[model samples]
Target chain A: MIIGYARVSSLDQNLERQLENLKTFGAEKIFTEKGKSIENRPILQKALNFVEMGDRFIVESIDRLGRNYNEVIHIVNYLKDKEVQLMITSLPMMNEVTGNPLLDKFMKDLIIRILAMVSEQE
Target chain B: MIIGYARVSSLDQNLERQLENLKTFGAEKIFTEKGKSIENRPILQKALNFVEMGDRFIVESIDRLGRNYNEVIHIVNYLKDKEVQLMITSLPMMNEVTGNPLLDKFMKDLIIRILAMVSEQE
Candidate 1:
């Protein structure tokens, strides 16, 4: 199953674009909410808990997971430990198959770090 | 009042250095804990809750607060909102004062972003 998670920073922000993108990308189900990254996000918990092994968790971008770099990495690690694949539409590092596992891992780590830094800036 | 918060990633790690640093920096009360950044840290919560107006919160470094960039930023914002000052021994940006409030704010924000990025890399 492909599950999606979307977030907006405040009650005033809209999740329409993210929702549309996730649906277009074939997300069967999506969990979304308007809340700060620092606040409790029950929907995010539900989405993460809903996934099973071999399932893919989709997001419009890395920032959709959260704006906190450390928290984002922690969530990614959690998903990896659960054997649930992560698919970020804006980040190609997730879907790229370089045929070299080591190199692929390196690139993904590099990209995650860069994107994490960028997310913090915003 | 001056309060200190110290954290280590695991039970085996020592908090002595952080403790000494906080004491040397004139912390009247200190909270220390060994735990992962993602785990429930009662000591941290206690420290945050213990502060009163005009109190200062001290840490060895921003990373000592937490490795989660967004979480750290959120905490800082919280302190700011409470009118509580944060004192990071390692980051001079926190202690330095300029006559220009706007410039000081900008510098602090810049330093925070850099340190947050560095913490995430670790």
Candidate 2:
């Protein structure tokens, strides 16, 4: 299934279009929240735990997945380990993977290596 | 003076174009190395350590700056602390800084924050 995750800063408190974008992206299952900051976004975990192998996991961007470099790296690693097809809507590299599932862990890690490195192959 | 860093994996054994790019980018001094693997890349330290507050630190990409995520973060932080200007030839964000020097730490760090997040603001 096409699963999506959407987020916005609660400080900014904006996600009106975030909701529609996921639906437009064909998210049958989406996890979302108005994250207060770096620490409060637990739905990132909950949505991650919800997937299994062959599941397509999607997000608007890395910032939605995490607050800083380490956190973003951590979440991307988790999704790859689970064999969930990872997608970042804003990233064109992900657009190919959206339709293409079961990407090898090696390929996923290469893409994970750089958002640009992902773009490197693109 | 514009300082450049160019690297290619010693295993692959390539760097023919890296020299020209840095020169074209207007590097007065450039550091070049072919590292055998992640741990042996000491010139990264030599180059980073050579800089003064106003020196421009430029590289082809973050992968050339570090073998992995943690090392890159450490190097970028060191440059920022010293208040050296940083430019990545492959990165457009760095191009703006190439002409614009003595960037406030806040602006430099924000760009340093993302090769992609730098691209994000771009």
Candidate 3:
């Protein structure tokens, strides 16, 4: 199944655009965040649990996946271990066209780490 | 004129998608990075210097804008002070349709703070 997760940091704001982007990208069902407090992230935690092997997991970007780069990297690693296909709307490498799974996944992983490093304090 | 800046943390990798996204979003000219050291984003600094009042400064996300959320917020604030319209491809609100500039900018700034606080998210 093509499943997606979207998040916002605050209680009052919403991104009509992220919803539109996910649907446009063909997310069959989407999980979203309602409240702040990345600590609980009740909805996000549930979304992470909802996926199974062979399922495609989708999110907009690392920023949408967690509270910060560390958590973002952590979640991506967890998804990788589950053998799910991960798709990030904003990170193009994650949505790569069909190719060698080993090399493709390698590149995506590399992109994630490098981008994570760049996205952290330097 | 719309000016864009794209950065990759490492020297070897590049995202074809960010390039396409920027051009598709109407970035007429783009400045990109060559090296990895965030200590001196020489190209990015040049890009920042190139933008002028009324010019739209475009990027894929806050990650593309700087080394970390702190620097990302710093750059956005810098652009705001310069009177340049900032467009983030991943953050839809930054690409808001024409509206009252005050409220529009206010919301965009809010989004920046919220995302910057992706950890301080509450």
Candidate 4:
């Protein structure tokens, strides 16, 4: 079964766009929630527990998973080890076939650098 | 085999106390680093690369690992998943199964909160 997971950072945030996209993609089992922080993301945990061996897990984009790239990579690697296929809808750029671990790390460093700059600006 | 790791926040910080503690814990091979920050700690990467499945890792305390709690949890969980045992000598109460998750979480939250408060104060 293809299990889809969606998330938003706060309770007031809307998840309709992502949800609609996943549903349009024909996700068999979709799980979602709002007001969830990465430290306590329930939907991600639910998908982890709900996913069986050989099942595929789909998400709309990288940011939808969480803000922390390292954590996301670790989780994705963990999922891959569990025989679960990871799919990113928007960033088809992140598909495992074309993804090199070193390149992924570089991409993450780029994101972190951008965020750090923005943080300093704030 | 026991593979111990010792780290200080800066190159000037002596690792004697931590190394001694790990030796007392019966660590056979100890990895020590005097890094200015965890992000640039070459020895940490070395120790992490050296660790194998079922090998034991010893540390003096939580701070020796990193300043961030969430990151620490992520690393510990990753290590645990790899069947590496982590032992903290200073925080003698911390263990794999018997270790206090709530306490660790609370302590981490407190530390972050304090750091934020200090940053604000600065």
Candidate 5:
């Protein structure tokens, strides 16, 4: 199942766009949070806790997960450790393309590092 | 009452130092977690949920709370909204010093921004 996670920086920020995108992407269930990525977002926690092995986690974008490189990497690695797959809508290339385990890992790491570095500049 | 929150990246990491500091700082209860900042940390959630107005939340350092500027600011603001105080042992200056609200806010924002910027570099 595709579990979607959406977050906005403040209570006033609308999550409609992300929600639409997640739904269009075929998310079975979506978790939303109206808070900064760094704060104790209970809904996001619930989403993570609800997912299981072989489940795919979807996010509108990597920045939606975190603003900092380390924090983003941390979340990505955590999900990986849980045997869950991550799908970033904005970065479709991040999704697994090849069946080869080694190649898939190398690509994932390279892209994550590149995107993380780019986010630092923004 | 004083409440402490401690976290490390992995279960293998030690919380001894932070635990001892929270005890010395007079924390009535401490919540500890072994996970990355961006990940779902249930214990940290529990600590936040347990705090009440006029309670002080202590961490070994701001970095222990999060490695990102946005995340740290989010947490500080969250605590502020909850009417709870935050204490970072490494940056003692962050603790509320005067009864003057304006001066306190100015100093807190200035120091937190400076430290958050510095953490970005590392």
Candidate 6:
């Protein structure tokens, strides 16, 4: 299953672009949150609960799924623990071509390290 | 030191209120994210990584910390594991009590249950 997650900060924001991207990316189930605080987003929580082992999680980008840098790294860690594969649409730099464990590990670590530095700067 | 975190969904959003609240609450160092997606928030991530075991994590509210319910719970669990205390500006309901072992366990369980149910509903 390819689970797509989309988020907007508030109710007035339209999700058309995000939805279109998710659909184009072949997300079987897309979770959309409108105008809700990230901590209060219901759809995202539902999608996370619904994901199972062997499932693939796809997002337009990592930023779509997080409110900040640590949150992104943290969520990635959680998904890793669940044994799920994650693919980000915007960042082709982090994609794994063939389940190459090293590539995935390297990309994930690289992103985390950069974000950790960014987090520290603030 | 009380570390404060503030986030807005978009770059255009003003963080005046959130920042004011953080200052009023006596935050020694407040992390702020501007015009950035939560996943890309540098300061917020930095705050999360900078804290030691004895630091207190302060935020304007729980919703201020995450883009979704699971994220909030996840962060709380992370903080607990790190032995950090959380103080929310909004939910004074959870703020007044002294930390007892049973109460701590119960609060943790309650938060998890509510968030789990919230996750399920989505």
Top model number, lDDT: 1
lDDT per residue as tens, model 1, A1-122: 88989888666766788898889878999887772363488889889899989899998877778777667767887898899998887764564658665345545655665666567667
- Model 1, residue A91: C-alpha shift (Å): 22
Q: Between 5 and 6, whose TM-score is larger?
A: 5
| CA displacement after TM-score superposition, residue A63 of candidate 5 (Å) | 32
- Docking level for model 1: incorrect
lDDT of 5 by residue, B22-103 (tens): 8987988888777225547678778878888999988887777777765676677688879998888777766566866544
Question: TM-scores of the first chain across all predictions?
Answer: 0.88, 0.70, 0.78, 0.69, 0.82, 0.76
TM-score for each candidate, following the candidate numbering = 0.49, 0.42, 0.43, 0.42, 0.46, 0.45
- When 1 and 4 are scored with lDDT, the better candidate is 1
Q: Each prediction's DockQ?
A: 0.03, 0.03, 0.02, 0.04, 0.02, 0.02
Candidate 1 at residue A57, lDDT?
Answer: 95
Task: State the lDDT of candidate 4 residue by residue for A1-122, as single tens digits.
Answer: 78899887666766788888887766888888662135677668888888878787888865676655336545766786688877767645543333665335334433333432332233
> Relative to the true structure, how large is the alpha-carbon lDDT of every model?
0.76, 0.64, 0.70, 0.64, 0.74, 0.66
Residue-level lDDT of model 3, residues A1-122, one tens digit each, is 88988877666756777887888878988887752235788788788788999998887765566545456666776887797888878765564545754345445655665555444432
Model 3, runs deviating above 4 Å = A11-14, A35-38, A93-102, A118-122, B1-122
Runs in model 4 lying further than 4 Å from the true structure: A1-122, B11-14, B35-38, B96-122
Model 2, range B1-122, lDDT digits (tens) per residue? Answer: 56888887655645867788788878898888772243687777788778888899887766666544434555675787798877878774643554433233224444454442232222
After best superposition, candidate 5 residue B65: deviation in angstroms? 0.6
All-Cα superposition RMSD per candidate:
9.2, 10.0, 15.8, 12.7, 12.8, 18.3
Candidate 6's displacement at residue A74, Å, is 1.9
- Per-residue lDDT of B1-122 in model 6, one digit per residue for the tens? 77888877666766898888887877788887652124666687688888878887888765567645445556777787888877766544464355654344445445444543343333
Report the poorest 10 consecutive residues by lDDT, candidate 4 chain A: A113-122
